[PDB]
């Protein structure tokens, strides 16, 4: 623990060797123990300021981060013959209610007292009050219509360039491989659409020898060509769809089509699903240039261009809002080797609760890395759970108010987050403020509710509730500050600042949060002093400032930057942190101080290293865990033992250029390293690819762009940053 003050200018080794853990609200024992899991729900300030004035003085953003549909190990599912909910604010009977008349409960959000119905009976022993996370079975009035069936619509771009990337094969291959794993019962419907300068529908009838490629060429007046076999029943037509998946790849080899009419294609896609809603998977490979939705080419910046982001058209935004209203979500797969204006395309996913996936310069032969990455991202994509036609709401105790939402969705009337689809990998953030002084209360609560239709046609409500203590002291607010959560909430904020103003402003606002918070701190207590809880605040922000999302002097391209922002906006806190500030470990010398508890596996636990090239060593090997991928950097003067016993090579010179993964050798060293890597991968459900390719000369050493602590020709070093902060803090 420690309520101690820290001087960032003297330590310079603050970063711990063990993974950071989320703070623990300063609550009584019995309450904290029922609190919601922090990987699911969390707050920037575990100690809620009592007044807006107090909040403002601390100069720290107040907000919540959430991962509502996260895969869980054990989920309490109540099938209650009635959902107990406060009669005023409609909050769900939770563990933080005040039971008094043991036949009357005090709602912890609006204080009103309610009656416990003769069905809820020791009413306090009920599951709804012994669990912060729980799933309810929605009664008939929680659905505007019969549970929609699961509907998947794959829309593939088949332009000349698309054909040249050769992605269609793997996509089709993955679909075949995972046809039976797609969430859903016998009601599942699947469909397919390809497109170039025209829209290509595909009918599937058991009575016919082969699938019909129905082509509509009227780009300004799209329409569904047939009424019965375009969205077929997977269960009954499994065979029919399997031939198609084996046929498509071989269909456009000789194509001469050069233009892509993504706009019209999506509108056609829309009309086909409009009736049931569902999930539309779009795979695009280039700038759209035909028909409505057309986008002009743009010239890529360079390390020379200043900080002088937003969509060039609203077509895709308008379209998404339409998809949203029909319970249609759109996931975007961009595998482009040239600018494609993702800044405008992304809109199709942001506002429809979809998500975008980016595979820069994807090529079946030339880019082995993007190939395996797509494979594994499709694996998770195609097999993770899914919820349909959903909505979510976040309620907070009176006095507190949410004023800004972050994430892919559409906000109906304040806090009626519309979610056509809801996936287990999406994260969300919220910004609140104290509208009414919490003088009355000493504890506040937050409750989010996810109303959706399962892949099995069942309306369900998953609920999470977080309880936190209220404090009236600047010192108490800082003691509870969650440095990572603040980092995350600031990124979301910064992204909007980018779109809303400029990248410069966004970058300043970021640096100001650190400066103003620390400055406020100092004016309330020689070197840069900060409380323990914020000892990593400048580090994580600097990291945030050097990321592909906000970095400047770099040679980063448009789509990459935007894709990075798309991730800040949709990714759960942890992945945001693993990406911005990747975990670095030395791995050519692992040993036994690990989790050698796991029955027959040891699992070394090497210490975490700070992201500086000064922690490296030309005699070792370093692994960097950046969440989505794992890069293993090998030193030029690495030991022979690691070359042959781990890499399987006899000398550094022969370490294969692109190396997609480690070989599994019959060697203790290999077993130790494979063990560590495999454990890392088990800590997430999105198999991260690994690549050693980071040689000392593979011109792929983009392992370094992460040593966020060193100085670049166009970036301050960690130490310089501290120097600049201190100059401002006590100006």
């Amino acid at each position: 623990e420690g309520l101690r003050v820290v001087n960032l200018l003297q330590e310079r080794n603050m970063l711990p060797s063990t993974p950071l853990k989320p703070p623990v609200p300063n609550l009584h024992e019995d309450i904290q123990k029922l609190n919601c899991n922090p990987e699911l729900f969390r707050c920037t300030l575990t100690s809620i300021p009592q007044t807006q004035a107090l909040l403002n003085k601390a100069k720290l953003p107040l907000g919540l981060l959430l991962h509502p549909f996260k895969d869980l190990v054990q989920l309490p599912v109540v099938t209650s013959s009635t959902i107990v909910r406060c009669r005023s604010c409609r909050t769900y009977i939770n563990p933080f209610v005040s039971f008094l008349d043991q036949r009357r409960w005090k709602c912890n959000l609006c204080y009103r007292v309610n009656d416990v119905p003769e069905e809820f009976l020791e009413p306090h022993r009920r599951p709804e009050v012994q669990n912060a996370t729980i799933e309810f079975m929605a009664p008939s009035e929680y659905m505007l219509r019969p549970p929609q069936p699961p509907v998947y619509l794959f829309v593939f771009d088949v332009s000349h360039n698309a054909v040249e990337t050769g992605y269609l094969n793997s996509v089709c291959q993955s679909l075949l491989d995972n046809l039976d794993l797609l969430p859903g019962n016998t009601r599942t419907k699947i469909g397919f659409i390809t497109f170039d300068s025209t829209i290509h529908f595909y009918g599937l009838q058991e009575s016919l020898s082969q699938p019909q490629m129905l082509i509509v060429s009227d780009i300004e007046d799209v329409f569904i060509p047939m009424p019965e076999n375009l969205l077929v029943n997977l269960n009954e037509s499994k065979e029919l769809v399997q031939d198609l998946l084996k046929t498509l790849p071989q269909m456009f080899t000789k194509t001469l089509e050069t233009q892509s009419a993504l706009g019209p294609a999506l509108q056609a896609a829309f009309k086909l699903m409009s009736p049931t809603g569902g999930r539309m998977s779009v795979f695009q490979t280039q700038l759209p240039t035909l028909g409505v939705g057309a986008l002009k080419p743009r010239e890529e910046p360079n390390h020379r261009s200043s900080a002088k982001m937003t969509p060039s058209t609203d077509f895709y935004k308008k379209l998404a809002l339409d998809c949203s209203g029909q319970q249609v979500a759109v996931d975007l797969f961009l595998l482009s080797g040239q600018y494609s204006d993702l800044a405008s395309l992304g809109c199709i996913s942001r506002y429809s609760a979809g998500s975008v996936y980016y595979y820069p310069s994807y090529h079946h032969q030339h880019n082995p890395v993007q190939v395996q990455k797509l494979q594994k991202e499709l694996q998770r994509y195609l097999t993770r759970k899914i919820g349909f036609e959903a909505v979510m709401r976040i309620r907070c105790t009176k006095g507190l108010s949410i004023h800004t939402f972050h994430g892919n969705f559409f906000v109906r009337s304040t806090d009626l987050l519309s979610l056509p689809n809801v996936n287990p990998d999406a994260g969300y953030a919220v910004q609140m403020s104290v509208e009414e002084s919490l003088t009355d209360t000493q504890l506040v609560s937050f409750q989010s509710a996810l109303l959706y239709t399962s892949s099995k046609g069942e309306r369900r409500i998953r609920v999470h509730t977080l309880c936190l203590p209220v404090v009236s002291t600047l010192n108490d607010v800082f003691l509870g500050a969650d440095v990572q959560a603040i980092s995350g909430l600031l990124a979301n904020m910064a992204v909007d600042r980018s779109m809303t103003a400029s990248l410069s402003d966004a970058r300043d606002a970021l640096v100001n949060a650190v400066i103003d918070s620390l400055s406020a701190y100092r004016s309330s207590v020689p070197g840069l002093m900060v409380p323990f809880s914020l000892r990593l605040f400048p580090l994580f922000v600097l990291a945030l400032l050097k990321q592909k999302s906000f970095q400047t002097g770099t040679n980063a391209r448009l789509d990459e930057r935007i894709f990075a922002m798309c991730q800040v906006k949709n990714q759960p806190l942890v992945y945001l942190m693993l990406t911005t500030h990747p975990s670095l470990y030395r791995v050519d010398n692992l040993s036994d101080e690990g989790a050698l508890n796991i029955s027959d596996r040891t699992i070394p636990q090497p210490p975490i290293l700070q992201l500086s090239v000064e922690k490296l060593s030309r005699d070792g090997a370093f692994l960097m865990d950046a969440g989505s991928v794992l890069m293993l950097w090998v030193g030029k003067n690495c030991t022979q033992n690691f070359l042959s016993q781990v890499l399987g090579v006899q000398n550094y010179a022969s370490i294969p250029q692109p190396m997609t993964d480690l070989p599994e050798l019959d060697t203790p060293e290999s077993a130790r390293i494979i063990a560590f890597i495999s454990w890392l991968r088990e800590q997430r459900p999105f198999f991260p690819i690994l690549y050693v390719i980071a040689d000392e000369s593979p011109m792929k050493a983009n392992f370094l762009q992460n040593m966020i602590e060193d100085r670049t020709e166009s970036a301050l070093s960690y130490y310089e940053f501290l120097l600049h902060i201190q100059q401002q803090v006590n100006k």
Binding site: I83, R85, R87, R90, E141, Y142, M143, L144, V391, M392, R393, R412, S413, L416, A449, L451, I461
Partner: peptide, 7 residues
């Protein structure tokens, strides 16, 4: 009258 409410 939104859906997840009931009032």
């Amino acid at each position: 009258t939104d859906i997840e409410m009931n009032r």
